[PDB]
Amino acid sequence: QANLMRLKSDLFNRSPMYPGPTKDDPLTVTLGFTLQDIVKVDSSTNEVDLVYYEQQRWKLNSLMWDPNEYGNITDFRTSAADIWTPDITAYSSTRPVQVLSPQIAVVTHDGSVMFIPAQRLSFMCDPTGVDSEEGVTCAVKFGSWVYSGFEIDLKTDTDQVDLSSYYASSKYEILSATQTRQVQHYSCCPEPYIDVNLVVKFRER
Amino acid sequence: QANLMRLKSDLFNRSPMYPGPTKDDPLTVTLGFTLQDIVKVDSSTNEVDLVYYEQQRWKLNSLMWDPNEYGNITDFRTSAADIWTPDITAYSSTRPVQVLSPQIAVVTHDGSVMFIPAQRLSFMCDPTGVDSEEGVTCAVKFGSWVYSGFEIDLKTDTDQVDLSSYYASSKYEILSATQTRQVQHYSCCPEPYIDVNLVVKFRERR
Amino acid sequence: QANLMRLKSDLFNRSPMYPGPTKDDPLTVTLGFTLQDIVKVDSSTNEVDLVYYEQQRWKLNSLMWDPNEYGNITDFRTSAADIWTPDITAYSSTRPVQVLSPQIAVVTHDGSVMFIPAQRLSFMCDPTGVDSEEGVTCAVKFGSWVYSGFEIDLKTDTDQVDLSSYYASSKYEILSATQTRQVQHYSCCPEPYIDVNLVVKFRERR
Amino acid sequence: QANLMRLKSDLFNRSPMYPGPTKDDPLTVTLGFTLQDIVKVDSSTNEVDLVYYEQQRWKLNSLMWDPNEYGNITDFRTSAADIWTPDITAYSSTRPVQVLSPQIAVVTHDGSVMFIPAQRLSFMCDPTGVDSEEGVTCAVKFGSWVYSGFEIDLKTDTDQVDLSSYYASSKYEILSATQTRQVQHYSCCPEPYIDVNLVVKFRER
Amino acid sequence: QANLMRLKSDLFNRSPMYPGPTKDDPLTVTLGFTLQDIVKVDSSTNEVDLVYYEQQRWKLNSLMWDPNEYGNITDFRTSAADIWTPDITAYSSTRPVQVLSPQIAVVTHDGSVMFIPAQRLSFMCDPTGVDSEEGVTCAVKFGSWVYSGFEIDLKTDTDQVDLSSYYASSKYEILSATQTRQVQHYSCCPEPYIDVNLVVKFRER
Numbered sequence A, D, E: 001q002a003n004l005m006r007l008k009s010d011l012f013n014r015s016p017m018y019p020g021p022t023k024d025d026p027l028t029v030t031l032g033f034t035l036q037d038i039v040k041v042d043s044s045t046n047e048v049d050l051v052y053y054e055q056q057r058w059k060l061n062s063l064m065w066d067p068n069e070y071g072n073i074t075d076f077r078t079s080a081a082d083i084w085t086p087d088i089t090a091y092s093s094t095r096p097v098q099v100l101s102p103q104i105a106v107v108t109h110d111g112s113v114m115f116i117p118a119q120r121l122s123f124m125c126d127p128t129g130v131d132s133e134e135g136v137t138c139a140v141k142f143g144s145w146v147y148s149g150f151e152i153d154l155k156t157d158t159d160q161v162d163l164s165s166y167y168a169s170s171k172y173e174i175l176s177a178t179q180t181r182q183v184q185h186y187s188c189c190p191e192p193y194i195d196v197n198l199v200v201k202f203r204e205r
Numbered sequence B, C: 001q002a003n004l005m006r007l008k009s010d011l012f013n014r015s016p017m018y019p020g021p022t023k024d025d026p027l028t029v030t031l032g033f034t035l036q037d038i039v040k041v042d043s044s045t046n047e048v049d050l051v052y053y054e055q056q057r058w059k060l061n062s063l064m065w066d067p068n069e070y071g072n073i074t075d076f077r078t079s080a081a082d083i084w085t086p087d088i089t090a091y092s093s094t095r096p097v098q099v100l101s102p103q104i105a106v107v108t109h110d111g112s113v114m115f116i117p118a119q120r121l122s123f124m125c126d127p128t129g130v131d132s133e134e135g136v137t138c139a140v141k142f143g144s145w146v147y148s149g150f151e152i153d154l155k156t157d158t159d160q161v162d163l164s165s166y167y168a169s170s171k172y173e174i175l176s177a178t179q180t181r182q183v184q185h186y187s188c189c190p191e192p193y194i195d196v197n198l199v200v201k202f203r204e205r206r
């Protein structure tokens, strides 16, 4: 207990928080989606509600330590407020995202961080043809709101969304769910922007 | 009031907060559910709303004291923000949980903590057959979001949910309610994962 | 303004906040309800919404002062966040209570505190028979969530709920509204538990 | 910018916040309503929703300064959290009031404060007869929750609610809107209770 | 990293926050709208819900630095709470605006600030004729709530709202969307007030 208290004090109370990446020191953020349920479909407003959990991973040199100096502690859990977290947001949401899980991250001695928020998201989708055999395709882009591809490099481990935790008695059946890295340009900035496109094909069970 | 002010100052202002359990220092958390009401059933979205209070108890050596050194004070009440609390959550919720009670915990001189938040939860459940004699079975898993079974040992005193405070004029009658501890070794890694599966069998009152 | 600034500084900046009552130093809290309106009745979920004022009164020796030492100031108003407040909650609510008034309390030189939050509460009630001449009876208990009768002694001035401020053009007419103090004993602990049962008999106007 | 930074520091960092009025030092608060729209009417719950802005004015000696000592600055804007604000509330609301504007106040060198929060309020009103030619009359009292007329003297500039900003394509048309000050006296206590009774007569367009 | 941590410390911890503009030191705020979707239309309450990005740009001398003194850092990202932000609000909203993006701003070495909050707004609009070929015209004014045209000079880059990110499968089709600067005079003091009128002509798809 004493060694962990000493580690947290040395990492967070001694030095200031990580101020975010720069062009000279970019950061790689790996995203992964686990789709739990398509809760609601609104044909009158063209909104679809998803329940999912987003796995986020990044590495910081400022969060590194030698386990031998801290009673062989290799990892710990801390409030997400105690550390820097990437500004990953849905680009086509219609309501503020609702958090369904505790905001706690796991820090490893090599500086690796894992943050897995469970969320409910309302996003822009026309559900016409959901009642058919062919179904309907919905798509939402996830990315850093303010950091370009020069500061935050977004990645996926696989393009396959995890559907092993998908609610078996859901109103909607998943036909396909993919997560793809895209490099986009905007009438904003000449720098490239990176997003992860979550594409879900579904129909009424 | 002076002895309690002195105790709170010695326990919270002198030392930093408990940083959570580790594999070398695991923590046992006892979980208990008291079901008060099945408020809403949504057949179009497959959501069911429960009102219940979740009893949580754990013991910390850092929260121990000698009552004789603090005017024979054996226990006290403090804001849940002043102490560490386990990250126990519903794994299949559809809305952020709503708190219906003050966020205050009871600390005993032996280091025991009791925190009983009253909550309204919307979770995933197909209520088809609720209008029948047989009823319908809903299930929701509770556990630590970030800690494994090597850090947090989640347990239940009984597998029976307390139904003594269940609303008598509820729209739904409950037929059975169990709280069972489950160990899931199947995930990735050699570490086990623990959860309390709250299983409720219910039907429309008649 | 200078004398009040000096008083608030001496009462709040000099000493830490009151840490709550103990068995050795209990606190009496007087509770009173002023029913303003029965806003909503939900026959499909068995929820009833009330708008009421909850008068709360307690006395603290730490909040006492001599008016002669502070320019003859006998009382003042302060944010409820600057002082300790009792954890009085509804035992059968279905939604987090909504606050409709500023969270400010009145402190008197004898240490008396007056806190009257205006609230909207959704609680468990079957409103079947509200459309009848006889009406329907709803009940909701109020009490400390974590303190027993040995730490917080809950009291009422009267058995009657103040209906003088009840909305005259409400959808529902009040036939009777009582607030009764109840002492309960549970098998698990020897301490008595106190609650105020708010019982309201009402029907659809005319 | 330097003179304003110096003024704010001298007014807020040097001295503690105004502790509120007393019987010996009473404060006059001038209240004014600008009705923007009657959004919703609920015949099943007897609730009416208004969108309006509430002009509040008071004067404090602690907020006075000599413009000549601060680069001829006669007034400034500050967050409402930096200053004391009166506890003016609706006495018959059914939902917590929703704030539609930034919580910023204007302070003048003579100690005058102007705070104009834009709000959405749900209050108790039977709207039976709104669909008729005669319309319906709704009333809602506003006043200090904890201060009596001996501490806060509530006033109005006019009896007329400002309707110059009322939404022209509203579902409901305003037939009359008064803003009248009332004194309530009791036999028990010598303390008067002051309120501003906002009375609105309206019908469906 | 070290140079950025040093820059943020020198800009925010050394000096107090920007206290806002004055008549003697006015500020130009550039406003731009990117309409993403007309989510909801409520014919019973006369409310229309929009999802848009509000680009805000201003320049402060207090936020200037020499990149050469800070490891050639030309820009950075910081929480909107760490800096002053203009009180730009919708004048005819019916609900508190909902934020759909992280509250982070970009600061450039010349003192330029870019803040782009993504929002969901419910505002006053009669949607009668939306089901027709001609459609319906909705308008909503945006401006500083407490600052006059003598303190905050509101500007636009173009008269045209960015519709390149408008949801293609929306329930409503955009016929025209303009953002125009207006100098209006209110019932208060003789100082002019500036706004940006967002006018949207739309119909059912």
Ligand SMILES: c1ccc(C2CCN(CCc3cc4ccccc4[nH]3)CC2)cc1
Pocket: C106, C114, C116, D144, D145, D146, D147, D184, D193
């Ligand atoms: C402490 C002191 C005052 C108040 C308010 C005073 C103004 N009243 C509207 C009219 C009113 C009723 C009423 C009932 C008891 C005593 C004084 C009262 N004044 C609303 C309550 C609240 C808390």
